[PDB]
Design a protein around this nucleic acid. Structure first.
Lengths: 98, 100, 206, 151, 127, 114, 83
RNA sequence: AAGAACCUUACCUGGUCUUGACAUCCACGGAAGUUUUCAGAGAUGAGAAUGUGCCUUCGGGAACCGUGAGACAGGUGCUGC
RNA sequence: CCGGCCGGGAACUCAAAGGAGACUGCCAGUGAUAAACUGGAGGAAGGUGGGGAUGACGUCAAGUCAUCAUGGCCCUUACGACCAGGGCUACACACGUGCUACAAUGGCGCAUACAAAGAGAAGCGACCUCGCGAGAGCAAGCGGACCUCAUAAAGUGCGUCGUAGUCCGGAUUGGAGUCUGCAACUCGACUCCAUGAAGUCGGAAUCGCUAGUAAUCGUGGAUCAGAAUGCCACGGUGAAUAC
């Protein structure tokens, strides 16, 4: 039972990552549960934009971290190895749970 | 922002990791619940006779670029002005202007 | 206080980021500081060599630095050899080993960092500022651009009272979020002080 | 406001015995965002009211509300700049609301053991024309009668 | 069988299953009286069943998350409206003329920057 | 109805009437009435005299009104005759626990005439 | 206040100084920059000149001073009156 | 100032250092580094041991640190008119 | 063992990607054959649906040379640098902005219900034991829709106080502590016991608010070793009035 838990900031980028993972795994012998959209984490920073006074002048930024779960059940060794040989993109962070 | 202060913070970090490896060991004698009274009093004094820098309550977490004490954020490790500059320039990944 | 940064909002809407990676709460400040160090180290050595921007990716515990330069043969030098020297500092100053690519700039009179470098270079050569602005504006509009606005602020001739002065030709719609506008500022340090050049270039709508 | 003639909101009809007037009275009575405690005060006022009248609670509320009710009021207006007090006729949806407001603001005084007993006193004293609500009404009617020259 | 309605109101989410039966109402393994005790949802969950006189011939199974008491009450009412809309398309025409069909959205306003609680400015003083 | 220092009220409950003594508050009166076994609800007027004496000795266990006033005045005088910092703050009529002295402290500094 | 399980606080240099003054047996003052040190019972009867920021004020350790810090008997801010 | 017990800290009293706490250069050496003591409020001042590594022109070269001169370094010092 | 607890289900809440929708699109009336307005239908939504981001040319020679950068002056055994202690926390007074109150729409005690958003690795720290409590001990889980912070509070039901400076208020002060931290005197937060001040709705004046708003109730985060009544966010209940 291998679960591929992968995070990214850009959601159009993380669609592509889980797409290549589900395609390569579902190619040769795996009954995966597919992409699971675990909730996006919105992290908000309020910063002051003046170098001095004017406390009321402020900017609110956010980092949105998108989670995607892929659940391989009935695994195969060439599926997990040909999954490992992919180096999809910079911007996605993968964690394979054995 | 006074290069001597950046030198002071980098002096404190260098003492901090080393005598923090020593300090977490020697600080456990004072307050476990039941070590002794002799070694409690001994550990108090030997904890005192370390340099004051190498206590991690003495660092300020200054900014990396300007070295500014106030307005710090721990996520980026910068001050607020340099976070705004790097966010507008696009240097920080995934940081959009939030509106909701 | 006016005028939010154009790239800073089209980061979300249109323009791509300059950094493309992911980090947890631990690795974020270290990655960000290493990226700042490699940008400020490449900045001078290719600020003689007409650079515009570098894009840092962090794939698989390594750093990947794309350099968008207007003179690629000056960056690569003889046989690409100078780029290897860049690798043997960046793979040092990033920690992780380096892979440095050079992306070309097709028309260097449409990339705003290069135009700000041009006007600041001319202003440090003590030319008249209006000659530099009108030459850059006419060059961009005659090479084909939907709009350009240059703006210089500072003492601007050698002058006790400092003023701003700008030129637009074409349309520069800053409120249109679906518009493609690239903007950069640079600083010209002359003997009277600092003169700041902000240039906006509108290329079309996305 | 300045421009619009914006339409009024709709309040919920009453749970116990349906009336928009009773719901408006509860809404005028409640302070600090507490609808339930004011509803309980109104109900334990109107349950100890219909026994001291014999006429039941909605009708005792209606003609106890009638004796404190304005038909003209005083506004301030300018013609030349002297800025004096003029009489003007009132709206019916304004006059019932001004009645409820006068009853509750007179019932905040005459302190008794609880607010429900205070409403039980002041609804009855207004039903028999000697409360402070009808005294405020008689003040308004006297003041708008004394200035009757301005039409 | 089962006719489903969903009702959201003020961050409350209710899901209602209406069926032919008794007058008994079940809500999170509880009755109506032991879940809501005050004026609201002893009345407002009765209102779409009070417009068309069918309180006795149908029974409900309601499960609800989110919000508070009156928000959950309006969520259940808006869900019972959809659940009774699953009965007959003439019912929505008969109860469109009294409310109950609109989602009644009106979420809380986010706290604005510089202000105190999204409208209240903090105490301007000239000198 | 007569606990050696003072008199207690008779129409209050026994907890609240016990709190009239200098030296007991809510918790100490609760503990005293829990030891003596009187319910907290009943008034003083329903109590009887043997039960008032079995209240009296438990109030006599603690330090109460007279020697408590002696103890407090002796400690504050000990501070003021010590020469410590809290002694000087007790002297000049200023806040002792490090409070704001610039703006507030209108309890310790007295009502504001000037 | 400190915790009770930690014990009372004194500097090591002040403890060495007061034990040197006990084995020496003299009653000559000693000037200290250790305001954060709790007064110990062996220090009773010898004047200690505690630093207050400018000068060293000499305080005489009595029996009643045996709980407090040394700096509590050395005022730092001077104030006489606004008139 | 999105947070003054020390730090922060720019302020004051006292004790100290000068190519300097932060950089580059030049000459001479010493592995760096670790433990521990005494004096001192501490900065510092004095030691006593331990280790001696990498490529090798291997009298050397990279980090490290000490000493000496001069360019210099440093200034939260002034003018946001 | 009735606990989504387990098989299982892919309906529903939800999660996130992708679309549809709202455009004066339709109808009537009035207007210059117009733009538009007024009303109505359907529609979850009605006319920029609500909110945010978005700040034109310029004004104040507005603010910052103490975030940074910088032209010019000034200092160089000193205005540079290191350290300990102090101070930034003082206190006859004046103002600005907030918090808590003056109570019965309330205080206290008991029982019970309903949230959203967020943080967590030299960190969040279950269960159990000890302590009146702050907390201590031992200690699983968790880089998290899993685990923890973390029992939401107003509300509700019963009792009690019966309008007193009072069972209101909780300042001040004494004693005893806990925890972080080399170190809590100057000068931390909290706990428990005792104390129980002013204050009974506030002068001339003056502020905010047009609907899920004002008001009221709690929660969370950043900075942070420790230290919010501030700031930034989040939900519960929830008005009145506009001629």
């Amino acid at each position: 039972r291998i679960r591929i838990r992968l995070k990214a900031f850009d959601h159009r980028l993380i669609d592509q990552a889980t797409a290549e993972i589900v395609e390569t795994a579902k190619r040769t012998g795996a009954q995966v549960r597919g992409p699971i959209p675990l909730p996006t984490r919105k992290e908000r920073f309020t910063v002051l934009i003046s170098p001095h006074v004017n406390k009321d002048a402020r900017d609110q930024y956010e980092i949105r971290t998108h989670l995607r779960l892929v659940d391989i059940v009935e695994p195969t060794e060439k599926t997990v190895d040909a999954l490992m040989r992919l180096d999809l993109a910079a911007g996605v962070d993968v964690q394979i749970s054995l | 922002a006074k290069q001597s202060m950046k030198a002071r913070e980098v002096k404190r970090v260098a003492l901090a990791d080393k005598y923090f490896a020593k300090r977490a060991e020697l600080k456990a004698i004072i307050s476990d619940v039941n070590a002794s009274d002799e070694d409690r009093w001994n550990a108090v004094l030997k904890l005192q006779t370390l340099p004051r820098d190498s206590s991690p309550s003495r660092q300020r977490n200054r900014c990396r670029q300007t070295g500014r004490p106030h307005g710090f954020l721990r996520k980026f490790g910068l001050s607020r002005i340099k976070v705004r500059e790097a966010a507008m320039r696009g240097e920080i990944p995934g940081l959009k202007k939030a509106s909701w | 206080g006016q005028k939010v940064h154009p790239n800073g909002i089209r980061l979300g809407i249109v323009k791509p980021w300059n950094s493309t990676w992911f980090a947890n709460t631990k690795e974020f400040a270290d990655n960000l500081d290493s990226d700042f160090k490699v940008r400020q180290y490449l900045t001078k050595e290719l600020a003689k060599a007409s650079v515009s921007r570098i894009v840092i990716e962090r794939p698989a515990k390594s750093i990947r630095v794309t350099i968008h330069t207007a003179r690629p043969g000056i960056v690569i030098g003889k046989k690409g050899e100078d780029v290897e020297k860049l690798r043997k500092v960046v793979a040092d100053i990033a920690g992780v080993p380096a892979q440095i690519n050079i992306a070309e700039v097709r028309k260097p009179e449409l990339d705003a960092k290069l135009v700000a470098d041009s006007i600041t270079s001319q202003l440090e050569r003590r030319v008249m500022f209006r000659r530099a602005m009108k030459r850059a504006v006419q060059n961009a509009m005659r090479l084909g651009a939907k709009g350009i606005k240059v703006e210089v602020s500072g003492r601007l001739g050698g002058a006790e009272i400092a003023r701003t002065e700008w030129y637009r030709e074409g349309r520069v719609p800053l409120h249109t979020l679906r518009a493609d506008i690239d903007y950069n500022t640079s600083e010209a340090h002359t003997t009277y002080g600092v003169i700041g050049v902000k240039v906006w270039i509108f290329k079309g709508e996305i | 406001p300045r421009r619009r003639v914006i339409g009024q909101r709709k309040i919920l009809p009453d749970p116990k015995f349906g009336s928009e007037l009773l719901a408006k009275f509860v809404n005028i009575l409640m302070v600090d965002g507490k609808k339930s405690t004011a509803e309980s005060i109104v109900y334990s006022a109107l349950e100890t009211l219909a026994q001291r009248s014999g006429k039941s609670e909605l009708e005792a509320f209606e003609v106890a509300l009638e004796n404190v009710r304005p038909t003209v009021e005083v506004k301030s207006r300018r013609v030349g700049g002297s800025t004096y007090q003029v009489p003007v006729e009132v709206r019916p949806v304004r006059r019932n609301a001004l009645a409820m407001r006068w009853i509750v603001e007179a019932a905040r005084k005459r302190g008794d053991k609880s607010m429900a007993l205070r409403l039980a006193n002041e609804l009855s004293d207004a039903a028999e024309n000697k409360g402070t609500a009808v005294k405020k009404r008689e003040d308004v009617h006297r003041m708008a009668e004394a200035n009757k020259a301005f039409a | 069988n089962q006719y489903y309605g969903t009702g959201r109101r003020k961050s409350s989410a209710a899901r209602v299953f209406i069926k032919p039966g008794n007058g008994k109402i079940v809500i999170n393994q509880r009755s109506l009286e032991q879940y809501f005790g005050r004026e609201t949802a002893r009345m407002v969950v009765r209102q779409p069943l009070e417009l068309v006189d069918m309180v006795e011939k149908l029974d409900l199974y309601i499960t609800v998350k989110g919000g508070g008491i009156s928000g959950q009450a309006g969520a259940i009412r808006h869900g019972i409206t959809r659940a009774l809309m699953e009965y007959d398309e003439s019912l929505r025409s008969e109860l469109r003329k009294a409310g109950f069909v609109t989602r009644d959205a009106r979420q809380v306003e986010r706290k604005k920057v510089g202000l105190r609680k999204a409208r209240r400015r903090p105490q301007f003083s000239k000198r | 109805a007569r606990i050696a220092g003072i008199n207690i009220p008779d129409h209050k409950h026994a907890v609240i009437a016990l709190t009239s003594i200098y030296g007991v508050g809510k918790t100490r009166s609760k503990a005293i009435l829990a030891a003596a076994g009187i319910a907290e609800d009943v008034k003083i007027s329903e109590l009887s005299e043997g039960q008032i004496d079995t209240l009296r000795d438990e109030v006599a266990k603690f330090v109460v009104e007279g020697d408590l006033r002696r103890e407090i005045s002796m400690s504050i005088k000990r501070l003021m005759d010590l020469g410590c910092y809290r002694g000087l703050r007790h002297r000049r009529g200023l806040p002792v626990r490090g409070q704001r002295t610039k703006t507030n402290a209108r309890t310790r500094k007295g009502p504001r005439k000037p | 206040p400190r915790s009770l399980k930690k014990g009372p606080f004194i500097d090591l240099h002040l403890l060495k100084k007061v034990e040197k003054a006990v084995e020496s047996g003299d009653k000559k003052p000693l000037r200290t920059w250790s305001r954060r040190s709790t007064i110990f019972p062996n220090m009773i009867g010898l004047t200690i000149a505690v630093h207050n920021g400018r000068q060293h004020v000499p305080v005489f350790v009595t029996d009643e001073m045996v709980g407090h810090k040394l700096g509590e008997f050395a005022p730092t801010r001077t104030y006489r009156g606004h008139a």
